[PDB]
Amino acid sequence: NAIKYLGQDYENLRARCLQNGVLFQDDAFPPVSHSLGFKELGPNSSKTYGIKWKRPTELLSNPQFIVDGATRTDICQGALGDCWLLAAIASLTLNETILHRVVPYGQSFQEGYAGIFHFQLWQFGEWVDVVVDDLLPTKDGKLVFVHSAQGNEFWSALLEKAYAKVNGSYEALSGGCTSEAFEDFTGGVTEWYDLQKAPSDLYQIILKALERGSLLGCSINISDIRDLEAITFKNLVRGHAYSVTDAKQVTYQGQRVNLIRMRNPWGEVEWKGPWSDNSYEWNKVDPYEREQLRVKMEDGEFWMSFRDFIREFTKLEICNLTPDLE
Ligand SMILES: *[C@@H](O)[C@H](CCO)NC(=O)[C@H](CC(C)C)NC(=S)Nc1ccccc1
Ligand SMILES: [Ca+2]
Ligand SMILES: [Ca+2]
């Protein structure tokens, strides 16, 4: 039932390319400099020096669309300020159902491969099917923008290309709002929380939202752009979207403590305060919980106590997946 974005028809385009023995070349979002940007990603910018658009097949012998699931570890920001989109994609992967509504099953660099992929976005009160060819910006044989921790996996690179396409170029994605991407991925409605004015029931709100599969994001508001992406003393990033990926209570020295888990879409650079991966607090928790919850890995994902979280972060976004009609 999805609208064909720009009347481009995924199955017909793929059937024709296979028939004519060619690879799709997307005339609606060509491998050219207007698709990158005009300013920072302008043609005469040093950011775009040496960029060549390459298909994943031109990059290695065995490219894969999905390796071991479409999971949040597949989301590692490249040279673009699209943290807000990426945080929203990492959150999306927590619920398999809505994930694969955005990223339809069956997509491959083998069976049915004609250099064309497709994704479904919610735009102006309807689901739309957006195609892209798989020419991607690379420099020295490496992806410039989003990439997966798994070097041969391409679904997230292609999803971000499709989202850049609906916005006109990659550069349109620099600076934005996690909610917008949450809504584009879901049809949901977003409610936001000022963490310095949190309702006394906010942790319960978080628990229930994550149970129901809603998308959660958080950030440290900046009011001065010299603070954009500043790293804090405890290794948070300012003006930067994180994904909220879990909320669990632990038994710490016999006491119950509210923890919250989040993920920097960079795929690295984590909190170093209490509850961090190598933090001391973990030694004092139930060993079933420690083994269940704590992973010692530089992967961008970490825990904080809810107490520290509502001190350090300033904004929480919750996207509800089943909104009321109006
Ligand atoms: C994350 O990589 C980027 C870096 C910008 O170059 N940060 C943003 O896009 C932030 C993300 C928020 C704080 C969650 N948003 C910005 S800079 N501005 C903005 C624009 C539109 C709506 C809200 C916020
Ligand atoms: Ca994967
Ligand atoms: Ca970690």
UniProtKB/Swiss-Prot annotation:
Domain Calpain catalytic: 23-322
Main location: cytoplasm
Entry annotation: catalytic residues: 83, 240, 264
Modified residues (Phosphothreonine): 322
Keywords per UniProt: Autocatalytic cleavage, Calcium, Cell membrane, Cytoplasm, Hydrolase, Membrane, Metal-binding, Phosphoprotein, Protease, Repeat, Thiol protease
PTM summary: Undergoes calcium-induced successive autoproteolytic cleavages that generate a membrane-bound 78 kDa active form and an intracellular 75 kDa active form. Calpastatin reduces with high efficiency the transition from 78 kDa to 75 kDa calpain forms.
GO CC, one annotated term: postsynapse
Molecular-function GO terms, alphabetical: calcium ion binding; calcium-dependent cysteine-type endopeptidase activity; cytoskeletal protein binding; enzyme binding; peptidase activity
Subcellular location: Cytoplasm; Cell membrane
Superkingdom, taxonomy of origin: Eukaryota
Alphabetical GO biological process terms: cellular response to hydrogen peroxide; mammary gland involution; negative regulation of actin filament polymerization; negative regulation of non-canonical NF-kappaB signal transduction; positive regulation of cardiac muscle cell apoptotic process; positive regulation of leukocyte tethering or rolling; positive regulation of vascular permeability; protein autoprocessing
Subunit structure: Forms a heterodimer with a small (regulatory) subunit CAPNS1.
Family, per entry: Belongs to the peptidase C2 family.
Role of this protein: Calcium-regulated non-lysosomal thiol-protease which catalyzes limited proteolysis of substrates involved in cytoskeletal remodeling and signal transduction. Proteolytically cleaves CTBP1 at 'Asn-364', 'Gly-377' and 'His-399'. Cleaves and activates caspase-7 (CASP7).
Protein name per the record: Calpain-1 catalytic subunit
Organism field: Rattus norvegicus (Rat)
Encoding gene (name): Capn1
